[PDB]
Amino acid sequence: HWGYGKHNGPEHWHKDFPIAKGERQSPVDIDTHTAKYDPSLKPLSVSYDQATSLRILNNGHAFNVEFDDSQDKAVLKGGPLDGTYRLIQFHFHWGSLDGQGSEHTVDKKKYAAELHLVHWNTKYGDFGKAVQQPDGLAVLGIFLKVGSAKPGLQKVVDVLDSIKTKGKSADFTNFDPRGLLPESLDYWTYPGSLTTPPLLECVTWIVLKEPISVSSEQVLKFRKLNFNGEGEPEELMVDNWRPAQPLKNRQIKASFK
Ligand SMILES: NCCCN(CCc1ccccc1)CC(=O)N(CCc1ccc(S(N)(=O)=O)cc1)Cc1ccc(F)cc1
Numbered sequence: 001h002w003g004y005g006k007h008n009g010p011e012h013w014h015k016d017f018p019i020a021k022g023e024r025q026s027p028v029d030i031d032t033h034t035a036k037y038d039p040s041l042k043p044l045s046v047s048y049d050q051a052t053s054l055r056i057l058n059n060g061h062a063f064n065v066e067f068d069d070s071q072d073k074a075v076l077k078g079g080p081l082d083g084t085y086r087l088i089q090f091h092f093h094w095g096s097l098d099g100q101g102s103e104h105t106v107d108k109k110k111y112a113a114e115l116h117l118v119h120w121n122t123k124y125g126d127f128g129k130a131v132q133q134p135d136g137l138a139v140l141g142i143f144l145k146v147g148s149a150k151p152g153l154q155k156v157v158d159v160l161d162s163i164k165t166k167g168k169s170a171d172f173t174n175f176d177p178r179g180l181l182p183e184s185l186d187y188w189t190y191p192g193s194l195t196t197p198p199l200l201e202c203v204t205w206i207v208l209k210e211p212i213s214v215s216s217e218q219v220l221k222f223r224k225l226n227f228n229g230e231g232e233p234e235e236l237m238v239d240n241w242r243p244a245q246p247l248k249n250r251q252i253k254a255s256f257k
């Protein structure tokens with residue numbers, strides 16, 4: 001099965017998922033000098049007031065905080081998007097050390113982690129149908145740097161002890177994802193893919209320029225999770241990021257001057 005180790009990591013994924021070598025793969029390096037300001041882009045609309053979190057799950061490659069997406073409760077619209085995209089889950093990618101962990105890079109800089117808020121286009125009815133479409137998903141990516149603690153992340157950090165191993169889940173109601181957003185919604189956007197198998201080319205990526213700060217203690221708790229299941233040899237869940245992929249025939253657009 002695919003993963004992040006030497007024998008099953010990103011350089012191997014193409015054997016089971018040939019789209020790994022496709023024309024719109026993610027993540028990518030964001031070259032800030034080449035990204036063009038697009039005055040036609042609209043401000044992003046992040047409407048999370050009615051978000052309903054339900055559960056947190058260790059799925060063996062990250063942890064997902066899952067939301068009720070049976071109604072338009074937490075939605076992303078505007079920006080580069082046409083239509084309405086419903087929040088289904090968020091998760092992170094992070095490193096073994098603070099100098100790596102993000103999937104996107106900025107002028108080749110790697111951040112300590114990257115948060116992905118995953119949304120699907122309601123015109124396709126369900127997430128499984130949406131991933132089959134080139135405009136099916138919108139993922140909002142937010143970089144994490146290590147410095148001051150992020151108060152709105154602590155409730156996530158403190159439940160991780162309860163989902164240490166693959167397949168464990170825990171009730172996770174009443175979590176407000178607005179507490180994970182930076183001040184500015186300035187962003188870069190480009191067409192890309194899921195960054196884990198099946199690597200489907202169905203994502204409009206929206207990557208915020210402003211990182212959030214988390215504390216060393218917060219990210220250290222991410223790094224105590226396990227890729228393995230209970231009662232299996234311990235493999236710390238670290239370095240669960242895919243490196244930057246070729247940009248090919250794509251333009252990254254900036255919402256800001
Ligand atoms: N236990 C989790 C096991 C890993 N993986 C199994 C999927 C899979 C299917 C076929 C073959 C291989 C693997 C996760 C999963 O199931 N997802 C999440 C999809 C996803 C969302 C966001 C990003 S990201 N990092 O933000 O770009 C990446 C990926 C739901 C889904 C639902 C319906 C689909 F048709 C496809 C995926």
Ligand SMILES: [Zn+2]
Pocket residue numbers: 091092093116195
């Ligand atoms: Zn992700």
